[PDB]
């Protein structure tokens, strides 16, 4: 019995808890962009749209005796909005395994859920770094008001240091001086692990002093690619309405399908706080 009908919930409370903990742990081990981006407060599942403010140019403060200067930014004539998507992945559970776990106390195995969570995290990172042409989203490597600098030769040591100082100078010439963060592909990240004879240490350690907010690697980046960003809530952030969670989809062919899902969007308010190599 209990497999001869159609149920609302096929699992017990402890199994639900274990499933959720597994999903959370895999996500925390796999995510990257949440280490360099701030999170605009979590809104709720009912919220499906957020404002998309875009600022251009440089506007500085003022120093004077009597405060009779404007020094205020103006709203865009348009003030566009954008829609928050859904990112999800599905997995399956067989009913005879559940039957064994309840008749002869054999522990339940949830490795398919871990696989689905890993794939969902990879999808989120792909959406952050590149965009979505059919949905009209832009990523960090495809923004239009972004700065660019040539990569140069990294086969010999010192090439990495030359490119990151040039990128920081280009970001300097636009009014952005905050702590920088660097993200690289595996070829560049591995090539930065040699000894620099001009310093006597590993080349990665000088760039870690230059950045001071982090040097990371991501397998979403293609070939030899890298990005340097100036961090801060006023330049870019992540608006999330619902964090990663799991949901039962209803029985089909006597088996049990589930979904892991989340809802978030990336907001780039200052497109010149980026620089791609």
């Amino acid at each position: 019995p209990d497999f001869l009908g159609h149920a609302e919930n096929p699992l017990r409370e402890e199994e639900w808890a274990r499933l959720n903990e597994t999903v959370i742990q895999v996500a925390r081990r796999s995510l990257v962009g949440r280490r360099i981006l701030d999170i605009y407060g979590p809104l709720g599942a009912g919220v499906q749209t957020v404002p998309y403010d875009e600022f251009q140019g440089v506007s500085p403060g003022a120093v004077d005796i009597v405060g009779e200067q404007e020094t205020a930014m103006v709203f865009t004539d348009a003030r566009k909005f954008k829609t928050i998507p859904i990112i999800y992945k599905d997995f399956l559970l067989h009913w005879r395994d559940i039957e064994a776990a309840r008749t002869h106390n054999m522990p339940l195995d949830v490795s398919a859920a871990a696989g689905a969570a890993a794939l969902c995290a990879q999808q989120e990172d792909e959406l952050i770094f590149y965009g979505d042409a059919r949905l009209g989203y832009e990523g960090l490597m495809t923004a239009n008001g972004r700065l660019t600098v040539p990569l140069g030769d990294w086969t010999s040591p010192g090439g990495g240091f030359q490119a990151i100082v040039e990128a920081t100078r280009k970001l300097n010439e636009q009014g952005h001086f905050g702590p920088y963060a660097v993200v690289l592909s595996p070829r560049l990240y591995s090539q930065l692990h040699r000894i620099y004879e001009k310093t006597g240490v590993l080349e990665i350690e000088t760039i870690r002093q230059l950045a001071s907010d982090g040097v990371y690697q991501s397998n979403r980046l293609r070939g030899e690619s890298g990005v340097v960003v100036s961090t801060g809530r006023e330049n870019m952030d992540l608006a999330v309405s619902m964090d990663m969670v799991a949901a039962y989809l209803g029985a089909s062919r006597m088996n049990h399908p589930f979904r892991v899902l989340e809802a978030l969007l990336l907001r780039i308010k200052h497109p010149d706080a980026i620089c791609t190599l």
Binding site: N20, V23, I24, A27, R28, L31, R34, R35, I36, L37, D38, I39, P42, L43, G44, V240, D243, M244, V245
Partner: peptide, 10 residues
Amino acid sequence: EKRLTVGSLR
């Protein structure tokens, strides 16, 4: 109450 799960990683 609405809460985060994975949470902030900064």
